[PDB]
Amino acid sequence: EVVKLLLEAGADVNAQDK
Amino acid sequence: EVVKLLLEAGADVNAQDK
Amino acid sequence: GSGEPREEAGALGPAWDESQLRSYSFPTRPIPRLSQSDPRAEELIENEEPVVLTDTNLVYPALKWDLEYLQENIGNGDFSVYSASTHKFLYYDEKKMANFQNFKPRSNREEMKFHEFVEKLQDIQQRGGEERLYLQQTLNDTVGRKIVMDFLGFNWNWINKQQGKRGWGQLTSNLLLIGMEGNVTPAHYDEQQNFFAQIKGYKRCILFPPDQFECLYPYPVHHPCDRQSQVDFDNPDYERFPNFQNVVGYETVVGPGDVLYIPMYWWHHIESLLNGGITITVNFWYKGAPTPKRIEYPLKAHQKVAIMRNIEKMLGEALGNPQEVGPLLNTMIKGRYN
Amino acid sequence: GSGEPREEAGALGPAWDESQLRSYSFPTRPIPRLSQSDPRAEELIENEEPVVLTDTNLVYPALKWDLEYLQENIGNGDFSVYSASTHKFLYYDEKKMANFQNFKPRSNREEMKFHEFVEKLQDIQQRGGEERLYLQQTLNDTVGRKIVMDFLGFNWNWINKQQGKRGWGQLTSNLLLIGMEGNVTPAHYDEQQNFFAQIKGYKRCILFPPDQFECLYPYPVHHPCDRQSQVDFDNPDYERFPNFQNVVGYETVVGPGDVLYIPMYWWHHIESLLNGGITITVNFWYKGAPTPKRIEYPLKAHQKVAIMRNIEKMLGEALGNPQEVGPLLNTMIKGRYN
Ligand SMILES: O=C(O)C(=O)[C@H]1CC[C@@H](C(=O)O)C1
Ligand SMILES: O=C(O)C(=O)[C@H]1CC[C@@H](C(=O)O)C1
Ligand SMILES: [Zn+2]
Ligand SMILES: [Zn+2]
Numbered sequence: 016e017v018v019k020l021l022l023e024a025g026a027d028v029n030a031q032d033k
Numbered sequence: 034e035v036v037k038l039l040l041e042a043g044a045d046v047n048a049q050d051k
Numbered sequence: 052g053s054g055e056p057r058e059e060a061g062a063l064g065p066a067w068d069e070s071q072l073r074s075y076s077f078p079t080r081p082i083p084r085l086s087q088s089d090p091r092a093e094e095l096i097e098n099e100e101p102v103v104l105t106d107t108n109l110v111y112p113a114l115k116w117d118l119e120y121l122q123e124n125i126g127n128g129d130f131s132v133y134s135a136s137t138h139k140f141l142y143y144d145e146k147k148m149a150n151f152q153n154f155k156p157r158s159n160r161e162e163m164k165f166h167e168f169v170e171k172l173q174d175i176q177q178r179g180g181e182e183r184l185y186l187q188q189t190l191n192d193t194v195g196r197k198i199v200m201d202f203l204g205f206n207w208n209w210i211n212k213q214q215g216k217r218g219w220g221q222l223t224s225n226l227l228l229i230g231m232e233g234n235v236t237p238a239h240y241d242e243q244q245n246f247f248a249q250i251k252g253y254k255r256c257i258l259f260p261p262d263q264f265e266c267l268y269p270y271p272v273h274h275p276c277d278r279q280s281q282v283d284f285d286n287p288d289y290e291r292f293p294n295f296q297n298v299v300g301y302e303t304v305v306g307p308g309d310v311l312y313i314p315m316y317w318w319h320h321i322e323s324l325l326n327g328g329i330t331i332t333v334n335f336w337y338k339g340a341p342t343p344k345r346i347e348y349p350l351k352a353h354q355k356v357a358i359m360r361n362i363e364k365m366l367g368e369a370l371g372n373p374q375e376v377g378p379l380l381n382t383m384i385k386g387r388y389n
Numbered sequence: 390g391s392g393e394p395r396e397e398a399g400a401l402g403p404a405w406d407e408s409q410l411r412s413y414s415f416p417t418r419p420i421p422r423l424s425q426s427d428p429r430a431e432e433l434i435e436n437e438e439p440v441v442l443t444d445t446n447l448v449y450p451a452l453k454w455d456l457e458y459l460q461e462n463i464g465n466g467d468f469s470v471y472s473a474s475t476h477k478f479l480y481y482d483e484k485k486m487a488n489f490q491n492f493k494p495r496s497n498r499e500e501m502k503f504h505e506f507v508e509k510l511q512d513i514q515q516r517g518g519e520e521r522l523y524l525q526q527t528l529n530d531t532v533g534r535k536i537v538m539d540f541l542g543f544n545w546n547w548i549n550k551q552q553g554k555r556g557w558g559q560l561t562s563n564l565l566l567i568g569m570e571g572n573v574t575p576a577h578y579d580e581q582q583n584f585f586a587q588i589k590g591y592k593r594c595i596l597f598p599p600d601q602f603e604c605l606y607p608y609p610v611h612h613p614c615d616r617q618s619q620v621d622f623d624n625p626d627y628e629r630f631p632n633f634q635n636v637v638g639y640e641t642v643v644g645p646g647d648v649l650y651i652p653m654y655w656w657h658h659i660e661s662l663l664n665g666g667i668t669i670t671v672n673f674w675y676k677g678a679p680t681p682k683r684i685e686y687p688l689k690a691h692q693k694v695a696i697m698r699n700i701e702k703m704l705g706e707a708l709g710n711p712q713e714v715g716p717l718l719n720t721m722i723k724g725r726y727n
Contacts, residue, residue: 021358021707028241029142039369046579047480268724348709371686377726386606388715
């Protein structure tokens with residue numbers, strides 16, 4: 016569990032959210 | 034969840050486990 | 052360098068020349084330029100390494116796009132247009148500015164109609180102003196009929212097969228990018244896979260692999276400039292950022308019809324060539340494949356980056372204040388791990 | 390200092406004197422010595438601050454214990470006896486030695502019967518040897534009838550009420566400690582609450598609050614000496630451990646009948662007085678109260694310690710190798726948070 020927690024990728028990119 | 038995960042205390046003391 | 056400037060067909064001379072490239076402190080070697088039918092191209096994408104594909108026809112119907120065509124046809128929706136008094140359009144998340152009230156961005160976002168962008172651009176050129184604009188807008192349903200038809204004519208067959216072959220997630224957006232000559236987007240990495248489709252003009256792309264994290268010094272995760280390098284490429288502070296003296300880039304200049312695979316987590320610095328006129332690009336952002344079921348050790352660089360990001364996020368939440376993350380980390384390491 | 394040496398009843402003179410205390414680099418102030426009926430004593434325990442209680446009768450039936458009585462009555466079980474050629478009995482976890490094959494402990498553990506401990510002690514004294522012994526053994530069911538009766542006669546009424554009043558968890562063990570004059574247990578903290586009941590001889594106890602983490606430099610969590618200070622109190626390396634120049638201790642000398650509350654996470658350095666003869670202590674370790682339902686910010690020092698420990702544990706697991714924890718932490722901070 017904890018390992019998969021720390022390995023989880025985000026999805027942020029250089030485009031401003033509204 | 035994650036906050037309580039990081040706040041959880043252990044119970045280790047200066048006595049050798051077998 | 053990027054390799055010899057490509058010579059245009061019909062004896063139209065060098066597309067660009069080295070005098071149009073900005074001068075930086077680090078060496079580079081060229082990103083391969085290959086046909087999409089070349090097995091080496093498939094090998095690089097599979098191994099999450101960059102490649103320029105010269106013949107995908109990915110955005111073939113958009114190659115006719117210019118400001119006149121777009122203004123006539125792209126509709127009356129709002130477009131995000133950034134303005135700066137510098138060539139550097141450093142990205143920042145407006146939503147994180149509360150965490151860092153001392154951060155004063157050098158670029159500002161203004162919403163306007165496409166014709167107002169063209170007019171502001173025209174005002175600047177006539178008056179000889181130094182103000183710079185960079186339109187950066189996600190394509191959406193408000194675009195006009197002819198843009199819809201052009202978009203439908205992208206090579207979805209080819210890119211859909213890439214998405215499937217690589218196990219990627221969904222297409223999240225297509226960013227339309229229209230910049231002035233000399234515009235720079237400073238080095239940063241993204242947490243999505245990217246096919247970067249050049250339409251008009253020429254962009255120099257300098258990439259750095261994820262294992263150069265130590266050399267490129269991203270801002271803290273809670274800073275507005277999360278994922279961007281703190282190093283001023285035009286004046287690097289080697290006292291603060293000593294391992295920037297070890298950075299080595301992968302370089303190319305993409306022109307109309309080229310597609311650059313920018314793999315997830317790869318750093319990239321993008322610049323519109325000096326004296327090259329306006330540039331137009333459309334990108335294709337895909338969510339990456341999920342974490343594999345079985346973890347193989349030792350971890351890859353991008354997995355350590357994912358871990359570091361999550362440690363910063365979790366500490367910010369647990370400490371109740373992102374400003375306490377640094378002090379706790381320093382307390383952990385000083386005289387213990389350093 | 391510890392305060393004026395207590396004068397024994399019946400005009401028997403000072404129990405001890407300052408010449409029997411080792412010399413260190415830092416200032417201290419005294420831990421309060423109070424009656425268990427003093428509301429200030431309850432106030433300190435409730436606020437997880439140390440206090441010496443002079444009249445609990447917690448181990449009153451054990452005050453008659455000496456080597457002859459214990460040998461006759463403590464049974465034929467095994468006792469852990471540490472041996473060292475130095476006065477410092479630095480604790481280490483044998484089970485973590487695999488992580489750090491370069492760690493060479495200066496004390497060794499040998500299992501023996503109680504009469505063999507008494508005999509080895511006697512051999513050393515006669516031969517004038519410099520070898521030191523420290524018996525450290527959890528009390529268990531193998532003890533003889535008279536020890537059982539003595540143990541049943543501890544003041545369970547008083548300590549059970551403390552456990553209940555403070556919301557602590559279970560009594561996990563009672564450690565029997567028998568040391569030679571001059572023996573030192575170097576500074577460390579424990580993750581349990583502790584009532585430290587002195588039986589024979591005198592021990593100087595120097596405590597440091599959890600907010601002095603930055604000054605005391607615990608070993609890495611995966612090191613055998615997890616929770617112990619890396620600073621050699623007898624020769625502090627101020628280049629490696631500069632904030633040890635800021636440490637300030639809380640000091641007392643406990644004698645027979647005294648009970649010291651050592652709160653969970655408080656650092657403590659314990660030494661058997663020079664030329665004071667053998668010392669006997671029994672402690673009472675209790676699991677701490679659970680994490681509260683509602684977290685109040687900003688966090689207390691002991692909560693930040695708990696977080697730092699868990700970050701180290703999680704990274705060691707996720708990276709698959711505890712040796713990679715330091716390098717990842719340094720990569721996170723260098724030029725980013727420092
Ligand atoms: O496509 C990306 O990954 C980006 O970061 C975009 C925003 C900076 C843009 C540029 O072409 O100057 C590209
Ligand atoms: O009681 C604790 O918390 C300990 O750490 C024990 C082991 C070192 C011992 C000593 O009295 O020298 C006490
Ligand atoms: Zn990007
Ligand atoms: Zn202890």
